[PDB]
Design a protein around this ligand. Structure first.
Ligand code: GDS
Ligand code: GDS
Lengths: 237, 230
């Protein structure tokens, strides 16, 4: 019964028995594609193009109320009923709990993982994103650099928190988890796409560098970083 | 493990070591947790972490709360009866809901909708309303270039619209009062009261947000939690 969800009018399901992903390769979108690749859950990816204002369409918003990617529609949700969901961090937790992977069953570790996920969702994403605005997008042209410097300094502070935490450790929690999947695409985005490597003094965070490199070596990460592409759009036009 | 193993307790000793320890300040994020504790009826001992004194930047505080922020907790009666340290208001809300079996629906689909709205709060409402505070109420108000202010004001208006349209015909964010309401409404109150941003964000227009906020503020646990720690 996916036809009850208007999003499917705009991105029809070729495989309605599979989880539907509505996304774009961005630091938030790739959290979810990476997660799906890691856990081996079948899914059907759909490209939501910002160039066409797709994320502002009534069909998209009918599921993803905040007009943002990523969003999912899982036909095999609780009770075998479809589950609509947005917010990358909520989707990560949902998928971890659904699959039993990448979120510890040990309660204390569960909560430590959720803590670091929330740190990402409130700190890393929002603050690194402002560095992008003030160094890579329109804000880069603003002559008054006090705003830029606010967000750069805060991003450096957050990197320091990560760096100190990761000393002596492989991952944020005792096992690789959704907290890593949430954080490291954003670290990558800051130092690659936003061209902010020197601005945030990245070379001083040796532990973050080490763990980022380990993250990027993972085959599921390399796949998930690239998904969705456009091929799922072509037959429809 | 015993509570003295956590260096935070050197600076804020536990007078009641059998009780959950809260390290907080009356702020939109701190009151999420004090409100939650009041709602669920769990005993706790609150400690004031003074921003005026840079307490949140002390080594003792940071030893538990690694991001140097309030709120944080240390629950002696954590899972398996072992002490559990935790920071991030949204994580603490999930923890307390799961510990108490309150304020998350038994319907897992409703639980996930609730967690969605909690993440919307944690990534959108808190960070963006907080920037309106900086650029309207605190020192960023002095900046002659208003493009940053307007960026955050416009985004805050957009977020309020999302809430407002969602709340039409509803009492709460999910079908029952939940941790998502507790996360969101203290921030709405902060924006319009503390930051004096009521005209700035055109708050008058969000009739559903106003209605639900008013209901929220009538709850006794909310009134009590707003003032803790004193
Ligand atoms: N909390 C949400 C954030 C989702 C999100 O930001 N999605 C972006 C693409 S990810 S790309 C990263 C994203 N940037 C943007 O969205 C750029 C556009 C924005 N309106 C602006 O002016 O900065 C960002 O900084 N995010 C901060 C964070 O993660 O907390 C989107 O759909 N934008 C469409 C739109 O805005 O119309 C989540 O985790 O899912
Ligand atoms: N994600 C964390 C956020 C916690 C948080 O922001 N705590 C504040 C007090 S709540 S008061 C609201 C808070 N403001 C501030 O923290 C003001 C100081 C800041 N450094 C600045 O320059 O703006 C804010 O805007 N928060 C955004 C959000 O909730 O996402 C704190 O301890 N600050 C100490 C410090 O910065 O040294 C959570 O949910 O627990």
């Amino acid at each position: 019964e996916l036809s009850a969800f208007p999003i499917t009018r705009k991105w029809p399901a070729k495989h309605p028995e599979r989880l539907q992903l509505y996304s774009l390769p961005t630091p938030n979108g790739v959290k979810v594609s990476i997660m799906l690749e890691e856990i081996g859950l079948a899914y059907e990816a759909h490209k939501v193009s910002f160039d066409n204002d797709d994320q502002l369409s009534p069909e998209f918003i009918s599921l993803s109320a905040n007009n943002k990617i990523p969003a999912i529609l899982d036909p095999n949700g609780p009770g075998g009923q479809p589950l609509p969901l947005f917010e990358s961090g909520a989707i990560l937790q949902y998928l971890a709990e659904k699959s039993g992977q990448l979120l510890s069953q040990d309660p204390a570790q569960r909560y430590q993982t959720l803590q670091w996920l929330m740190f990402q969702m409130g700190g890393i994403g929002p603050m690194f994103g402002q560095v992008g605005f003030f160094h890579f997008f329109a804000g880069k042209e603003y002559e008054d650099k006090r705003p830029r410097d606010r967000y750069v300094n805060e991003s450096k502070r957050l990197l320091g928190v990560l760096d100190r935490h990761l000393k002596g450790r492989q991952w944020m929690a005792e096992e690789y988890s959704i907290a890593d999947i949430a954080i490291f695409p954003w670290v990558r985005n800051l130092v690659e796409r936003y061209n902010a490597r020197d601005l945030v003094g990245f070379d001083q965070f040796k532990e973050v560098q080490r763990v980022l490199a380990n993250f990027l070596e993972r085959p599921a990460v390399q796949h998930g970083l690239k998904i969705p592409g456009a091929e799922n759009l072509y037959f429809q036009g």
